[PDB]
Design a protein around this ligand. Structure first.
Ligand SMILES: [Mg+2]
Ligand SMILES: [Zn+2]
Lengths: 65, 99, 297, 17, 214, 41, 123, 236, 105, 12
């Protein structure tokens, strides 16, 4: 119930949900502790272009971008 | 060869970490004034579950009343208490086998 | 006989603080109840050697536990000045376990014992109180002096009689029907626990602080019947075998002894390096096993 | 005739806001 | 808020300190008890539950005999005012007394409003392993108590409300439906004789003395 | 006397504690048995 | 309702199901038709099976639950083949569809959530 | 290519009893057909000169995957009584019935009424299979139908596998008997890693007075799957 | 007496209810302070309602029942015309047919 | 007897 914890944790969780690494149903600090580096690597434009079928390879996606 | 390993890298080792604690690790944590769970979380920034075997718990009991503080710390509800059916009490052999 | 003597059987683990209370189940041999200093009560299966249930009974120590003679309930006392009644059957599904009744009190009771036949229990705090299970108030109170009574025990034969030990090194005998104490005897040092002979109505044995054990005939309290002299520290607990020919004693020195009632020396002594300061001991009901509770949890 | 008051239908709403 | 802070808050401890009593004259007495007598006399009917509900909150969260006795004195002085309350009439006293003795009166504390979630179904998948276990507090965990703990105090208050109403001739045979309302009380007072609490039995016996004269 | 006797016993055993007999226990729940019982009583 | 169409989704679960079916079509991850749904079960590449409970002969799709119980694949029923037709991006009614396993897909979190929602229906 | 129909091939016994190897241009794992001339699920069979063997598919069976994966012991041998939990239609059950032979018995438990009808039809032709259409979570509901058994095989795929196996083991499994348990990591806990699930399931077995002895993964044919073999109440 | 009688008792035991045949055995050959060991807690309560016997499912009882199940064929040898092993195979089929509503045609 | 609970003596 510390006000600083509530304020800053809500801000951090909202930012993490906005960038897409967390889920709307996982809005707790424990799930932040669960995060990995592949979750952030999946949000790059290069991998997004490849996963949506615009490119046929990850390097092809990089070249297209 | 275990499928969890990508050459020397353990992929199935996950942010919930299960840590096998040796008997002398507990005593030196007491000497250094370090709380067990809190100091492990400071090192890893993740949830850590310390684990105590029957072999390790037996060696603390054999130490006596001089080591009663370490015995109370080992029996902590957050800790994971796991059984072992070995011949002998030697805890270095037991921990190597689980690894 | 010396080659084949292997007494140790098993050790039960699970308390997170030192064991303080032991209670056996009147109807079942393999069910026993224990209480630790942190306030939890655990039920054990002796055949499986595991813990069946765990309840957070009290805050502080649990100072006593007794079982109703039918076996469907048990009673406990803690440092929160409370008397609680629980159901022996475990809670169904994942429901949190809830006491049958809870009684608020003004003093910290030290022990509790139950009538063998008549659904009555007694508590010992600063004064001996006799309770009816259907009354939240004690129906009788007997007092002689200003003392801290450590233990109270019902007599299994002639069930209206009681025994007690207090802090000015005396032993007091009561009588439930006439609602008065009977007689008082004072020894050199304080007695810790008292136990009745289950085959001899007028015989009881006292565990004393002067390293010794005293067997008394309650008709003639001027002199003890026998003295038992093998311990080297204060004797904390005693319990009789159901045959009534032997008893087992726990002491602050890390051992337990078995004495014949007619002898002054112990028949056997048990010890272990991991065992320290045995607090409570109960002879099992089929006269085949002995269980002890110590402070290494 | 005598009919005792029926308390089983008491809503007790008069004692609450 | 002001009165309950005096009787059950941290201020109540300072009433025992002799150093404070010597310096401060106002610390030598607790006048919150007398104000409840004034509040009970001049309160509306709809505001009775608001007066009583904070008391039941305290009893459900206490295991101390000393605090339970202070709530008992609090409830007694409220009932003394309620008997001489003008809006309090013979019909309302009987209706309030029956709800208190039979425990049908809805108090609806916060715990009943939000019961704990049930234990997870073992057939279903367990919860995520990333969730941190609850931190353990220093000095041991909280012990469970019975749900009907200290609730005999509210039953005793209903008996006292009826007993003093009958003795001061607030309840009279003549007029409206007093005999209709007093009739179910006979069966209700009979069952109180089998109660486990001694003070509940004593209160019912005192009430039974007057209701057998009707 | 009981304690004195038990102290000198050479052996103590612990714990210390017919078709017509079975015929009495049964009751009637078949209509034939009901009629026979009613007529015979 | 025919008792043979037992795992019938409610209104809320149907909306989630049809949303994921449309998304799977855009990711080239949907096989449409009873015969094509059968082949994915034989090849072990099926995430779950969605069927229409309003097929006038219901028996024409009842072979699919038998195949799912052997491969341990969840399956549900919906009330409309016409609504299932639009969600599959087809101008004709569809009585059975299959969502396909694809490595590295972005739908893995939504597919996992739907699979658990199905299994709770079977208690 | 593969093992085309009309090719000469050699059949030799396996290290495990009741199991055979079909040696040719490709090697296949086969069992002796208890009912000659019939295929349960479309498998290829081989005729010997009165004797017939059926090919065993490791993609459609978990016991075949463990055998091809190099497991030490399976304990299913001719003349043995086997309790099977989660029989489904009976593709693996049919091969198990082949291994035990006419003297052995198989108890097939399957709760689903859809797959239960297939299990009864399979039990028509094979006299050593006893179909049991009941929930394995309550073994007391079918205690009349089952005697003491030697091996328990469980492929139930539930979050509470260990509790279900332990309850059946206490009721029907003899002292010195063995169990074979297939573990799908995603079914017990999807949040936890696959390797951490396997260590937890072994721990739960030890807490139920069961002693696991070996484990292996089924990697070429399954992902995040394991099989554990152990003994129940070992003799001294 | 017959396969139909066995199937009726098999359904009753599964549901946890006391069949008339079971109550006939219990009333005739039990004295009337009695401990009865049963495999199912639900059938134990039903017997305790129907007759005054005390029913228990825990303790030594579960370990004794494994001994009985192991040695059953020796105890009842020759008391029945139909063998124990064939009886289980026959009842297993008939029990499964009833659950799935199998049609022989 | 190995499994029988032994109760205290009662008048008889
Ligand atoms: Mg070492
Ligand atoms: Zn070990």
């Amino acid at each position: 119930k510390d006000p600083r914890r509530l304020f800053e944790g809500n801000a951090l969780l909202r930012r993490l949900v906005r960038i897409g690494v967390l889920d709307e149903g996982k809005m707790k600090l424990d799930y932040i502790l669960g995060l990995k580096i592949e979750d952030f690597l999946e949000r790059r434009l290069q991998t997004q272009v490849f996963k949506l079928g615009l490119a046929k390879s990850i390097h092809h996606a990089r070249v297209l971008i | 060869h275990p499928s969890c390993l990508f050459f020397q890298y353990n992929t199935q080792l996950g942010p919930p970490y299960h840590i096998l604690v040796d008997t002398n690790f507990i005593n030196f944590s007491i000497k250094a004034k370090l709380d067990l769970v809190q100091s492990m979380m400071d090192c890893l920034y993740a949830k850590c579950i310390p684990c105590i075997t029957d072999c390790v718990m037996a060696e603390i009991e054999k130490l006596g009343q001089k080591y009663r503080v370490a015995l109370r710390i080992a029996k902590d509800p957050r800790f994971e208490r796991l059984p072992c059916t070995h011949k002998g009490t030697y805890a270095d052999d037991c921990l190597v086998q689980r690894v | 006989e010396r080659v084949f003597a292997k007494p140790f059987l098993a050790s039960l683990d699970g308390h997170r603080d030192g064991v303080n209370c032991l209670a056996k189940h009147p109807e079942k041999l393999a069910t026993v109840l224990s209480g630790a200093c942190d306030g939890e009560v655990r039920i054990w299966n002796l055949t499986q050697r595991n813990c069946i249930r765990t309840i957070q009974a009290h805050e502080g120590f649990v100072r006593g536990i007794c079982t109703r003679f039918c076996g469907t309930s048990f009673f406990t006392v803690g440092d929160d000045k409370t008397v609680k009644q629980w159901k022996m059957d475990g809670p169904g599904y994942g429901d949190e376990e809830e006491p049958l009744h809870t009684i608020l009190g003004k003093t910290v009771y030290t022990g509790i014992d139950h009538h063998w036949k008549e659904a009555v229990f007694a508590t010992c705090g600063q004064q001996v109180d006799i309770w009816d299970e259907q009354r939240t108030n004690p129906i009788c109170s007997m007092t002689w002096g200003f003392d801290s009574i450590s233990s109270v025990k019902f007599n299994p034969i002639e069930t209206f009689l009681l025994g007690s030990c207090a802090s000015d090194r005396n032993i007091v005998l009561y009588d439930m029907r006439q609602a008065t104490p009977l007689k008082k005897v004072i020894l050199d040092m304080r007695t810790n626990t008292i136990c009745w002979n289950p085959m001899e109505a007028f015989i009881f044995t006292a565990a004393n602080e002067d390293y010794n054990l005293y067997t008394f005939d309650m008709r003639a309290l001027d002199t003890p019947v026998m003295v038992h002299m093998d311990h080297v520290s204060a004797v904390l607990d005693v319990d009789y075998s159901p045959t009534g020919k032997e008893f087992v004693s726990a002491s602050f020195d890390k051992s337990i002894r078995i004495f014949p009632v007619d002898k002054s020396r112990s028949r056997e002594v048990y010890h272990t390096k991991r065992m320290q300061h045995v607090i409570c001991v109960k002879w099992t009901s089929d006269s085949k096993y002995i269980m002890c509770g110590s402070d290494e949890m | 005739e005598f009919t005792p008051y029926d308390y089983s239908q008491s809503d007790f709403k008069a004692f609450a806001g | 808020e002001i009165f309950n802070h005096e009787l059950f808050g941290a201020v109540a401890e300072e009433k025992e300190v002799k150093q404070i009593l010597s310096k401060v004259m106002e610390a030598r007495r607790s006048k919150s008890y007398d104000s409840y007598e004034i509040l009970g006399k001049f309160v509306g009917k709809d505001q009775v539950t608001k007066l009583i509900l904070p008391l039941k909150e305290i009893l459900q969260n206490t295991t101390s005999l000393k605090l339970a006795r202070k709530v008992h004195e609090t409830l007694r002085r409220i009932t003394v005012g309620l008997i001489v309350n003008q809006e309090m009439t013979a019909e309302s006293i009987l209706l309030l007394s029956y709800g208190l003795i039979s425990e049908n009166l809805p108090l609806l504390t916060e715990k009943e409003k939000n019961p704990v979630a049930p234990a997870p179904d073992p057939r279903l998948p367990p919860q995520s392993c990333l969730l941190l276990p609850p931190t353990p507090v220093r000095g041991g965990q909280k012990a469970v108590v019975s749900r009907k703990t200290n609730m005999h105090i509210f039953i005793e208050s209903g008996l006292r409300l009826l007993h003093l109403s009958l003795k001061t001739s607030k309840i009279k045979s003549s007029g409206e439906c007093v005999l209709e309302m007093l009739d179910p009380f006979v069966s209700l007072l009979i069952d109180c004789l089998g109660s486990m609490d001694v003070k509940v039995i004593t209160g019912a016996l005192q009430c039974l003395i007057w209701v057998l004269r009707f | 006397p009981v304690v004195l006797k038990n102290r000198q016993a050479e052996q103590l055993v612990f714990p210390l504690e017919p078709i017509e007999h079975v015929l009495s226990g049964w009751k009637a729940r078949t209509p034939l048995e009901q009629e026979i019982f009613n007529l015979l009583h | 309702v025919n008792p043979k169409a037992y795992p019938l989704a409610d209104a809320h679960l149907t909306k989630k199901l049809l949303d994921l079916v449309q998304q799977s079509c855009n990711y080239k991850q949907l096989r449409k038709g009873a015969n094509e749904a059968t082949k994915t079960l034989n090849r072990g590449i099926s995430e779950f099976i969605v069927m229409a409970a309003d097929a006038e002969p219901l028996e024409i799709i009842l072979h699919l639950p038998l195949l799912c119980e052997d491969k341990n694949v969840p399956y549900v029923f919906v009330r409309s083949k016409q609504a299932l037709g639009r969600a599959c991006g087809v101008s004709r009614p569809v009585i059975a569809c299959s969502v396909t396993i694809k490595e590295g897909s972005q739908l893995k979190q939504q597919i996992q959530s739907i699979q658990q929602s199905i299994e709770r229906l079977l208690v | 290519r593969g093992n085309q129909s009309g090719k000469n091939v050699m059949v030799e016994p396996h290290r495990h009893e009741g199991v055979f190897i079909c040696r040719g241009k490709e090697d296949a794992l086969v069992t002796k057909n208890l009912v000659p001339g019939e295929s349960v699920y479309g498998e290829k069979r081989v005729s010997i000169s009165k004797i017939e063997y059926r090919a065993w598919n490791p993609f459609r069976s978990k016991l075949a995957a463990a055998i091809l994966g190099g497991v030490d012991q399976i304990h299913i041998k001719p003349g043995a009584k086997v309790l099977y939990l989660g029989a489904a239609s009976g593709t693996t059950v049919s091969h198990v019935s082949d291994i035990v032979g006419p003297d052995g018995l198989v108890y097939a438990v399957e709760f689903s009424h859809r797959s239960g009808r297939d299990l009864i039809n399979l039990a028509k032709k094979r006299t050593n299979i006893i179909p049991v259409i009941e929930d394995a979570r309550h073994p007391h509901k079918y205690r009349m139908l089952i005697a003491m058994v030697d091996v328990i095989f469980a492929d139930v795929a539930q979050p509470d596998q260990t509790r279900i196996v332990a309850l059946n083991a206490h009721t029907f499994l003899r002292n010195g008997g063995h169990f074979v348990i297939s573990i799908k990591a995603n079914c017990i806990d999807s949040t936890a890693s696959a390797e951490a699930v396997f260590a937890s399931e072994v721990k739960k077995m030890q807490q139920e007075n069961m002693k696991p002895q070996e484990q292996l993964t089924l990697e070429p044919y399954e992902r995040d799957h394991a099989v554990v073999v152990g003994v129940y109440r070992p003799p001294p | 007496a017959s396969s139909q009688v066995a199937l009726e008792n098999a359904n009753a035991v599964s549901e946890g209810v006391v069949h008339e045949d079971l109550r006939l055995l219990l009333e005739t050959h039990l004295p009337s302070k009695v401990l009865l060991g049963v495999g199912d807690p639900k059938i134990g309560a039903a017997i305790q309602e129907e007759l005054g016997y005390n029913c228990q499912t825990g303790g030594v009882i579960a370990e004794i029942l494994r001994g009985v199940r192991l040695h059953f064929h020796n105890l009842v040898k020759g008391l029945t015309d139909l063998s124990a092993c064939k009886a289980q195979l026959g009842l297993g089929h008939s029990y499964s047919r009833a659950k799935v509503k199998f049609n022989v045609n | 007897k190995p499994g029988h609970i032994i109760n205290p003596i009662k008048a008889e």
